[PDB]
Ligand binder design. Structure first.
Ligand SMILES: Nc1nc2c(ncn2[C@@H]2O[C@H](COP(=O)(O)OP(=O)(O)NP(=O)(O)O)[C@@H](O)[C@H]2O)c(=O)[nH]1
Ligand code: MET
Ligand SMILES: [Mg+2]
Lengths: 409, 83, 22, 129
RNA sequence: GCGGGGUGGAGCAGCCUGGUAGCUCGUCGGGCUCAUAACCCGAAGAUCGUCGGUUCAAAUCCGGCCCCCGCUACCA
């Protein structure tokens, strides 16, 4: 399995996906046909091996396969770890899925375009979302250096070295790439091998995991007799799951009784485990996993339990409707082309509460200095007291990050 | 959720007894819902109206209004032409 | 008339009572 | 720390690589027939089907090429709006982004096409359609 | 994975229930009109995706293999 989850953030079309192509060799598909004409839309996914050419010279020593005869000589590169990416989209309004994604990440790579005016609306928006959430392991990258002057990718490296200054990003190193022709990527591999280090996760902890996809393996027309189970798609964060463990999802499906609303936990067994294209018997944090189940795929078709969280069956997790956020605000709206000042929060207003991987909306009942209580629509399964959350508003038709904080229970 | 954008032609038209009408044409009939859009727009204009094939029609001159309401909803200011 | 009003009053009540309930 | 960077910059950068014939358009009931749609696409190095797929999708009409290199679009369009939507094509699929030469090859891979100039040596990536 | 279509240049009928390939346009020629392809007349032109079977005989019925568009969906 992959050891660690790395984001690829940045502005729209700056080539976040193309840089996941040049490292993994895997494309996100670019799909929905509408993504095949737009660009990446659902969260991409791709894995690879990072060895190291011990018997040669760095950074070109940093391989992708067990093959060192590429650089210096043969001595089959000692394998260091296997990894996995999560490619967020770059378009301004697909803010609500990149946040969602960011509940799973152990580190990131900021893909700035060398041929556009540096602080681009989303490049920043993402960055401060990073600084907010706690993803303190960043590596900036200057992407399209194959279509610019040799003066131009330096003068921008000024602009990056000056923005990256008053912000927390000390020596966050800026490795210029060319995701297109896969030149100077092995030096990006040396960055990610040094700076984005493999954290320790205590396995004895309560099994908890997030979900960001889930799919009907059933092709148009698999017969009933070999109807494989439904498939939940997401990343473990704390613990390790095993093949043939009893499980529950939360908040889980809601019933209908004449206009009423009522969510409830669903139970099932782990039918199968798989990482990449290879099936496993256990699963551990870092990486996005997938869990074959025995529940009706109608329940997990398009991506129905998106935002849900998986835990042990017979575990202790509150399914809140109403919640106490301790919070703070950005002084600006780093997101809009325009930097208009974030107003102070008004009661009886609509806001988009990102908690974990779930992207709920909710209404504000109380407003203190830094303690607000939010009634919701679709519940939230609050697995701990250390639930980072992110707070957006509708400024002008398109949803915008404005404050953050922690969930209190 | 989805996206989709289109070229929008707004102009004065003609109906029976009573005043002129306002045509809004050029929306993507797969992605965009002219029936949800139009219910919203009849509220802004405060006019009766319909979805007339692939168009919305609104009774009276509403041409500055609608462009001002369409751009709000996250449509492009540069795809819209009031004639 | 009183049709009107009853449902207007009801809608006002609900919508507002929705805003209170929320 | 610039000296780690400015070293990485100097290491990437060391790995680096006729008017247009007047399109003759007519009308014949409800068809618009570009008489030299083959010769025109032959003199920008393009495939008839990529200028056809694009100029047809933009028009929102159907067509196929004749058996002697002629576009029979099934919809009667004025002799102007074909130039304005045939120039745009040039801008997005033949004019390189470095020196504006029109002297370009069109690469194809999985899902990334590139405009490759025969004069300067750079590559304008294009939305593959 | 199911369909839906493929036919003179072009738009497409015909295929169910097999038996000289039709229409509209265009072209081309002539004619009619004062001049109009406005009308009247004629010609040209599709071995009917592809490959094969069955049949005396197929564009039709049959099955592999393509080419565009609805259905599905990034399929751990
Ligand atoms: N010349 C050049 N072109 C590039 C480079 N990287 C990407 N491209 C091109 O730019 C286009 C957009 O790439 P893409 O990876 O989708 O950008 P993105 O930011 O990941 N899109 P999204 O917002 O969906 O994640 C592609 O068509 C690709 O061919 C580069 O380094 N050089
Ligand atoms: C994008 S799903 C996450 C990894 C999964 N086991 C496969 O792929
Ligand atoms: Mg991308």
């Amino acid at each position: 399995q992959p050891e660690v989850n790395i984001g690829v953030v940045g502005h729209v079309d700056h080539g976040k996906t193309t840089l996941v192509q040049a490292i993994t060799g895997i494309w996100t598909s670019k799909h929905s046909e509408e993504l095949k004409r737009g660009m990446t839309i659902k969260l991409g996914y791709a894995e690879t091996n990072i060895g190291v050419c011990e018997s040669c010279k760095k950074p070109e020593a940093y391989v992708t396969e067990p093959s060192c005869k590429s650089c210096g000589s043969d001595d089959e590169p000692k394998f260091l770890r296997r990894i996995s990416f999560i490619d967020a989209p770059g378009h301004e309004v697909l803010m609500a899925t990149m946040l969602s994604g960011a509940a799973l990440m152990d580190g990131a790579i900021l893909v700035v375009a060398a041929n556009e005016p540096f602080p681009q609306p989303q490049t920043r928006e993402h960055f401060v979302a990073l600084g907010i959430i706690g993803v303190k392991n960043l590596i900036i990258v200057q992407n399209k250096v194959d279509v610019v002057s040799k003066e131009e990718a330096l003068s921008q490296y000024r602009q990056i070295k000056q923005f990256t200054k008053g912000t927390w990003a000390e020596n966050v190193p800026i490795i210029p790439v060319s995701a297109l022709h896969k030149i100077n990527i092995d030096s990006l591999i040396e960055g990610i091998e040094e700076y984005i280090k493999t954290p320790y996760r205590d396995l004895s902890q309560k099994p908890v995991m997030l979900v960001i996809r889930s799919f009907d393996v059933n092709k148009p027309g698999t017969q009933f007799n070999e109807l494989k189970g439904g498939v939940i798609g997401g990343s473990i964060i704390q613990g390790l799951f095993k093949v043939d463990q009893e499980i529950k999802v939360l908040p889980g499906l809601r019933v209908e009784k004449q206009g009423k609303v009522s969510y409830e936990p669903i139970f099932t067994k782990i039918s199968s485990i798989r990482f990449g294209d290879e099936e496993f018997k256990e699963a551990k944090p870092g990486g996005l996993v997938a869990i074959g189940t025995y529940l009706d795929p109608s329940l997990t078709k398009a991506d129905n339990l998106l935002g849900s969280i998986i835990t042990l069956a017979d575990a202790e997790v509150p399914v809140l409707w109403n919640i106490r956020i301790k919070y703070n605000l950005l002084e600006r709206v780093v997101g809009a082309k325009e930097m208009l000042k974030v107003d102070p929060i008004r009661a009886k207003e609509t806001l988009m509460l990102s908690v974990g991987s779930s992207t709920t909306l909710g209404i504000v009942t109380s407003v203190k200095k830094d303690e607000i209580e939010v009634e919701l629509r679709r519940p939230v399964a609050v697995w701990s007291n250390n639930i980072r959350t992110v707070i957006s508003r509708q400024i002008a038709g398109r949803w915008r990050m404005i404050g953050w904080g922690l969930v209190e229970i | 959720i989805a996206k989709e954008e289109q070229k929008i032609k707004i102009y004065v038209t003609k109906r029976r007894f009573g005043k002129l009408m306002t045509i809004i044409e050029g929306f993507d009939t797969s992605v965009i819902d002219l029936k949800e859009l139009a219910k919203k727009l009849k509220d802004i204009c405060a006019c009766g109206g319909t979805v007339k094939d692939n168009t919305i029609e609104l009774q009276g001159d509403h041409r500055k209004k609608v462009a001002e309401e369409l751009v709000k909803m996250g449509f492009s200011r540069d795809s819209i032409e009031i004639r | 008339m009183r049709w009107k009003w009853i449902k207007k009053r009801i809608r006002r009540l609900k919508r507002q009572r929705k805003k209170e309930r929320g | 720390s610039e000296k780690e960077y400015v070293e990485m910059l100097d290491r990437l950068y060391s790995k680096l690589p006729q008017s247009l014939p007047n399109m003759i358009i007519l009308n014949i009931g409800n068809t618009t027939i570009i008489r030299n749609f083959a010769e025109y696409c032959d003199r920008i190095r393009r495939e008839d089907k990529i200028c056809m797929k694009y100029l047809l999708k933009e028009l929102a009409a159907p067509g196929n090429v004749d058996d002697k290199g002629e576009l029979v679009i099934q919809g009667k369009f004025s002799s102007q709006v074909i130039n304005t939507l045939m120039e745009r094509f040039l801008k997005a699929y033949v004019e390189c982004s470095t020196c504006k030469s029109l002297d370009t090859i069109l690469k194809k891979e999985k899902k990334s096409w590139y405009i490759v100039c025969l004069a300067c040596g750079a590559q304008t990536p294009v939305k593959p359609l």
